[PDB]
Ligand SMILES: O=c1[nH]cnc2c1ncn2[C@@H]1O[C@H](CO)[C@@H](O)[C@H]1O
Ligand code: HPA
Ligand SMILES: [Zn+2]
């Protein structure tokens with residue numbers, strides 16, 4: 001892959017067709033911060049697992065897709081999160097998990113990603129077939145390292161723990177303890193699923209930072225919530241370095257100023273927000289006004305295996321419907337690298353290699 005430099009960003013895209021634009025999108029040196037490894041599979045990988053383990057013998061491929069994935073516009077975040085629970089059928093042994101991780105790296109390299117942060121949920125992957133969380137973790141860390149070494153370190157991978165099991169104090173403590181225990185591999189900690197104001201778990205998140213682990217949580221995504229409290233908590237109480245989505249920052253001048261004052265970056269997932277019905281359309285997506293207001297934002301794919309969309313698709317949508325330029329896209333990837341949780345050298349070397 002012959003990546004675009006900072007000295008090649010004046011390209012005239014107006015005469016290119018969709019196909020030729022995707023070559024440019026691919027060639028952009030991307031840093032992706034918000035993507036769930038759990039569902040980071042191609043359609044063929046997914047159908048290969050469903051067939052190999054004989055999970056849906058009476059369903060056709062089209063039916064398998066309607067039943068497990070989320071490729072069409074839905075109602076809400078809540079609907080997405082509850083539907084996602086059924087494809088946990090695939091997390092059947094530790095080989096499926098290791099392969100998932102390895103292929104995810106390969107797919108991201110081919111899309112032109114150079115610094116990839118993946119996040120996974122131990123509880124998501126473990127509960128269906130009662131798999132051991134540490135054995136999952138082992139499988140995940142082997143797969144990712146397998147792929148990186150095979151690619152001669154042409155893509156670098158960071159790993160984040162999306163902690164869950166539930167919102168009981170015991171479950172959330174356990175989830176944070178799993179991450180802390182594996183902090184040699186986890187560069188950050190997340191909360192996902194149904195959106196929550198995490199104020200009752202400040203004690204746990206303090207602990208995680210005490211242990212040297214950066215926080216990026218999902219907050220300010222779900223537009224059905226009649227307040228912005230999850231955002232205030234993430235910023236003031238959790239001391240997040242980044243926010244997953246955080247698009248509802250756009251609804252408050254006070255929060256716009258707060259995130260800029262703290263140099264917090266918003267992990268924006270354009271297509272996710274459309275499909276999960278958190279913006280009216282891509283035309284009206286808040287990323288535009290947030291970028292224009294000086295908020296640091298990056299571009300991400302979120303759940304590519306469920307959406308049947310990839311990182312470059314999100315770039316296409318931002319170009320076509322919101323008129324982001326190549327220079328804008330390069331700026332955001334520079335921000336994504338700078339605000340990455342991986343080793344500071346890896347960042348600096350990537351920065352001077354491309355940006
Ligand atoms: O499709 C998915 N991929 C990855 N993670 C998911 C998905 N659906 C839900 N979670 C959610 O992430 C939680 C962390 O607080 C997971 O346990 C689960 O609730
Ligand atoms: O709960 C979630 N899990 C995984 N990806 C997501 N993207 C938005 N919400 C979620
Ligand atoms: Zn264990």
Ligand SMILES: [Zn+2]
Nearest residue numbers: 192218244302
């Ligand atoms: Zn997400």
